[PDB]
Symmetry: C3
Subunit: 60 residues, 3 copies
C-alpha cells in the first residue's frame, strides 16, 4: 500500500540524485574562479540531500 | 512511521529543488537568443515544482 | 491524508524530472567525443527514474 509507494518514491528520488550529480559534473566540465559560491552551495545541498536519502533508506 | 517518512521525502525533494535551481543558474552562466523556449519551460516547471512543494509543506 | 500527500510528492518528482530533462538538454547544447560514459549514465538513470515514476503513477 502506502509503504510500497514510499519505497517507490524514495527510489525515484535516488535515481534523480544520480542525474543531479551527473548534470553538476557536466557543468563543471563545461566551465573549462568566480564559481566559488556556486561550488559551496552545490556541495552543501548535495550533502544535505545525501543525508536525507540515507536517513530515508535506513528508515524504510 | 509513514508520516516521518513523508517528511523525510519532502525535505529530500526540497534539497533537490535547490540543486536544480543551481544547475539551471550554472547553465545560464555558461551560455554566455535561441533559448527562449528552454527558458519558458524551465520557468514553468520550476514554478510548478515550487507550488507542489509549498502545497506539501503546508499539508505536512 | 497520507494518500493525498504521496500524490503531492509524486507530482513534485514528476515536475523535477522535467527540469532534469531540460538541464540535460541544455548541457548537451553547450558541449557544442569524450562524453560517451556521461551519455550512457544519463540515459540509464533517466530511464530508471522514468520507470519508477510510471510505476508510482500506476500504483497511485
Amino acid at each position: 500500500g502506502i509503504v510500497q509507494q514510499q519505497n517507490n518514491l524514495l527510489r525515484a528520488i535516488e535515481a534523480q540524485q544520480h542525474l543531479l550529480q551527473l548534470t553538476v559534473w557536466g557543468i563543471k566540465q563545461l566551465q573549462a574562479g568566480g564559481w566559488m559560491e556556486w561550488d559551496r552551495e552545490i556541495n552543501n545541498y548535495t550533502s544535505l540531500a545525501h543525508s536525507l536519502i540515507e536517513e530515508s533508506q535506513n528508515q524504510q
